[PDB]
């Protein structure tokens with residue numbers, strides 16, 4: 001079938017090079033095209049690994065000289081970031097559903113030995129049905145290979161979402177770092193604000209949290225059941241921090257809160 005390989009670039013999705021919303025000339029299928037060294041070669045390689053309903057799908061890549069094109073799943077719902085109302089958050093059942101989907105995605109990634117390393121609401125994309133998808137594997141790396149764990153040492157992520165061990169220790173396990181960023185994402189969804197600039201003793205807000213001053217913001221806006229979960233996630237010691245199998249056993253995580261998607265109905 002002719003022209004099925006042609007895509008029109010219709011809108012800029014952000015700055016990374018750049019990312020464009022591409023529409024197929026024949027089928028009108030929407031895809032996200034990432035337009036760009038060894039850093040992109042690693043992103044393509046990790047993306048070729050990924051196959052999950054809560055992970056942005058990689059369709060392929062093409063090279064045209066110095067320009068590399070990455071064909072990725074387009075998520076029409078945009079970023080989770082824009083579902084968070086400043087200093088308010090979002091309804092608790094929506095945040096619980098987004099957190100369930102975030103956990104399923106992170107369980108998948110850790111299962112194949114991949115750590116994202118930069119989980120934040122700007123990277124958590126939503127599809128047409130508001131299904132959360134983990135995106136941007138530009139800072140992602142392999143932490144388990146041939147069933148052997150590789151401890152990490154590289155400084156990366158975004159400071160409000162980074163685990164405290166990254167700023168304090170030379171080496172750290174990959175998985176508790178992603179669990180921590182997920183907890184900061186959960187905090188943002190329920191309070192509409194970030195708890196600290198960075199998780200260090202020099203940060204008053206971080207010291208207040210370790211001293212359990214939950215009568216202060218953002219913790220005052222958060223109900224006791226999700227707050228009890230945040231108390232288990234945001235634990236300074238990464239070895240004492242709750243693992244994902246135990247997050248799945250938490251009382252709020254298993255609390256019936258949200259109704260299914262409004263399905264059409266008639267009466268009489």
Ligand SMILES: NC(=O)c1ccccc1-c1ccc2c(c1)Nc1ccccc1NC2=O
Nearest residue numbers: 013014015016019032074075076078135136
């Ligand atoms: N998250 C990314 O991979 C990315 C990296 C750098 C710059 C932009 C993006 C990006 C890619 C795709 C989307 C996106 C940002 N966000 C977005 C914003 C508004 C509407 C739709 C989308 N969907 C998307 O699928």
